[PDB]
Design a protein around this ligand. Sequence first.
Ligand SMILES: CCCCCCCCCO
Ligand SMILES: CCCCCCCCCO
Ligand SMILES: [K+]
Ligand SMILES: [K+]
Ligand SMILES: [K+]
Ligand SMILES: [K+]
Lengths: 106, 106, 102, 102, 219
Amino acid sequence: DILLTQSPAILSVSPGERVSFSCRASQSIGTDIHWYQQRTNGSPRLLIKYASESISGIPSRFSGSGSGTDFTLSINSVESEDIANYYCQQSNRWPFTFGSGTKLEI
Amino acid sequence: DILLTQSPAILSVSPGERVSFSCRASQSIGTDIHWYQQRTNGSPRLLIKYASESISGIPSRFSGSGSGTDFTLSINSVESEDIANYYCQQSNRWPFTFGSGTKLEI
Amino acid sequence: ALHWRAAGAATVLLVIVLLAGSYLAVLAERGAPGAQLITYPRALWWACETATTVXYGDLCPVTLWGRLVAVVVMVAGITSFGLVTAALATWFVGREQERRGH
Amino acid sequence: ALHWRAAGAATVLLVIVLLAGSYLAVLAERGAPGAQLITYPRALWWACETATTVXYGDLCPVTLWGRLVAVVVMVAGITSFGLVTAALATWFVGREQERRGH
Amino acid sequence: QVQLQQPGAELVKPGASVKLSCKASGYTFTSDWIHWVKQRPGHGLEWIGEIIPSYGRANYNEKIQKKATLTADKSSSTAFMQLSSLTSEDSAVYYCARERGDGYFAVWGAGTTVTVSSAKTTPPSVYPLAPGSAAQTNSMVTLGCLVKGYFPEPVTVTWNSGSLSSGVHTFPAVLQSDLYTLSSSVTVPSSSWPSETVTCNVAHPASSTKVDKKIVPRD
Ligand SMILES: CCCCCCCCCO
Ligand SMILES: CCCCCCCCCO
Ligand SMILES: [K+]
Ligand SMILES: [K+]
Ligand SMILES: [K+]
Ligand SMILES: [K+]
């Protein structure tokens, strides 16, 4: 099955600074990757679908990029509300799989 | 030809504990992998065919998973009768090849 | 005209096969590790390139039922396109007999 | 003759579809990460192997509109080749009735 | 409206079984798939299985133990997950998610906190936390509630029915002999209390318990 690697596990950044989360697949999955946000004691929330496509309701601060194996979730000038865990998920091959996740610290 | 790598060569585990055997192919072979069990002075016995498909006569304790390159044979709560050597075999490309084998110890 | 009637019936049936085939392929392919034909939008595209024979190879069924669905899509596609050609033949033949005086 | 007229009309239309399809595919595929159908020369080659059904798989559209363009190329190609065959049928049928005395 | 409704918590004795529910609303297509995701405390998301209600076919993650059995009711639009022979490993938050057959999980449920233990369900005791008589305050004042002795996880604490969200801290629970205990903090302007009513709302889904405790000065 497809293994999604998210490194580093913890990402520290100063307020108002651009940050980037990494997600690497064990195989080429085109752009079939999806990003989610999970705050403390909250349910996961869809941020980006299909690598780069925006989602209604999600701030324009969030963006995505990458294709094939390497994928990146970016946040232009992080805010306190961005403090959460970030997971990536692929839908290229069955079964669907999640990444280990990356924690954002300010 | 397709090289099947089984590491580690020896796998130690306490009684009533879930164990997992590893089998990695040098190329992507889909799910064309098969698992066998060989006890002391005995003939090999088919445990799992095509990565995950069960076999009649084999306890439900045995299960299989994986696709492409990485494959896994699992045993939920090992018993003394599970003491044997475990081999994997691919049928994706000619010729058929076997893995080096993994010995299970309790 | 029968030839134009069967042609129209083939085209609408082809569309039904494409939609249903796209639905059944996903249902059949999900559960099989490594399968890529597991989402409806690209499954519909797969059905199109299959019915038109094509077959880029970007998407392919790996299960027994997924492949059986594929065969139905192939035959339905080939039959329809073969029926359109047959209908075009009848139109031209019937027209040639008119400008000949037969 | 209608069958030879529609055949010639199909061939010239096919060429138009090939050229336009090569142009529209690039326009549709550019902007999508990983797309290879993004330059005109190979896009034209892609259109040819698509219209002839095939479909080596060396080039394939990944976007919705790129795939819609592909379908148009397929249908135009299949229809034209199917229309040529239909025209050849009319020629042979009309000829067989002559050497038979009918 | 909430598209996926899940029970708050489920207490299961070791070896027993439990049938989690997932009531769905909003738009429903035949191309909809309902997924289930397991998340253990301190761990990430783990895919369990999927099911298509319109056909009833279900697939499972074969990389892990086969603990689940997925069924669906098209009449009430509710999906079900049958977990059997549960151990301490199965103690986690189980989410259900809706996929439009396009690969991504558009909406998730609140999640059902499943606790596997041999203990007994215990309602929480909520006590007010008003400052002492000799406690000087500035422009802001801090109040609180003490959720003492409950089982199992979790509890939901809100201030003034959610209307008071800013300046609210709820600490993780600690375990003491099969009993959990936590506290919730709240900071409002000193000129607003107790002129305005400040009340914490503690809900314990495991025992269908929801109580309110008003915060008044110590007298
Ligand atoms: C001919 C269409 C049959 C639909 C296939 C469903 C198979 C389910 C997988 O077990
Ligand atoms: C049918 C031909 C349409 C041309 C496609 C252009 C699409 C632009 C990408 O947004
Ligand atoms: K072909
Ligand atoms: K190929
Ligand atoms: K062909
Ligand atoms: K043909």
